[model samples]
Target: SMEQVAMELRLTELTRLLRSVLDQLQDKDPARIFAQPVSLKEVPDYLDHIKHPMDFATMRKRLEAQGYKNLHEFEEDFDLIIDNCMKYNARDTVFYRAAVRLRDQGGVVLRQARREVDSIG
Candidate 1:
């Protein structure tokens, strides 16, 4: 099953390549914002520097303050945002496919890495 999963993960790496080509071809005046078009407000996880992680029991709940009840809620929110982006950003699914494909690739890498590290430990 792990090998099967790894195969699936490796297959998804093509999205990053597609994203670059899509940028060159899209031609939206080339003076634009994120190709995905969903703003950071719509997806706070889009931020590079997270000053504080949320729901830490009064320590700091950045996401909770941002309207997510919890991490799972944030996941649902995230999926919704991407789904919307897929629907709204373009006439098709090119950008949306890239993001979701890359997301799956990263998830697979993390999952396999976790299993290997834990097994070794």
Candidate 2:
């Protein structure tokens, strides 16, 4: 006796919102550096510094698979994506600067998403 199609609809709405956030982030990343995973062959020591590696490709894959149950989970990956870049790259590097810009801009997007969902219910 499970007639909660409404609940499923809400979940779909959540996924849509999460994907929108990813889309905006991807568009903001002009260099497309974060578009894929960091290759270990190129930077073998990358894993030594970044214990948890994240990227837009991985995030979108997970999103498409419905791996995230809520916005916070999506946000954690988003933060990790930016955090890992800053941690692995030097401050003067483009990666570090891009992470900073994405963090600032994405923070606003996250907050706005929260408000949008909250307003609905």
Candidate 3:
């Protein structure tokens, strides 16, 4: 009886955590979830318009291409940019750039991934 009670509690807690995690990612890029149209130049310009450094632009590409979902799973390639943005507290600007690319590639990625998945045995 006690084991079953604990199991139920674990299930309930898991449900709550999933809701929150999904919300977190969506909150970061809610528009991405719905698929928004954006210009390629617009996003690059918007990102460079802020920092305008060679480093920022390059890092911006990785950040954009991979698309950050959560801390655990983000562009390993862009870890430097991610860390720098956090360290300098330029996270807001980074968020803006992130949204730009997410909207740029969000729905496109979803559709492509649908066709791209391979089931493993």
Per-candidate TM-score against the hidden true structure? 0.31, 0.92, 0.28
TM value for model 2: 0.92
Tell me how far the alpha carbon of residue 113 in candidate 2 is from the true structure, in angstroms, after superposition.
Answer: 0.5
lDDT of 3 at 120: 12
In terms of lDDT, the poorest run of 10 residues in model 3 is: 112-121
Q: What lDDT does model 2 reach?
A: 0.88
Candidate 3 lDDT (Cα, whole model)? 0.39
**Shift of residue 18 alpha carbon in model 3, Å:** 1.4
Q: Cα miss at 37, model 1 (Å)?
A: 6.1
The best candidate by lDDT is 2
lDDT, candidate 2, at 120: 71
Model 2: per-residue Cα lDDT over 1-121, one tens digit each: 2547777777778788888888998888989989999999999988889999999999999998878887779889999999999988999998899999989988888899888878874
User: Could you list the CA RMSD of all candidates, in the order they appear?
Assistant: 14.6, 1.4, 14.7
Instruction: Tell me the TM-score of model 1.
Output: 0.31
lDDT of each model, Cα atoms only? 0.39, 0.88, 0.39
Clashes of each: 3, 0, 0
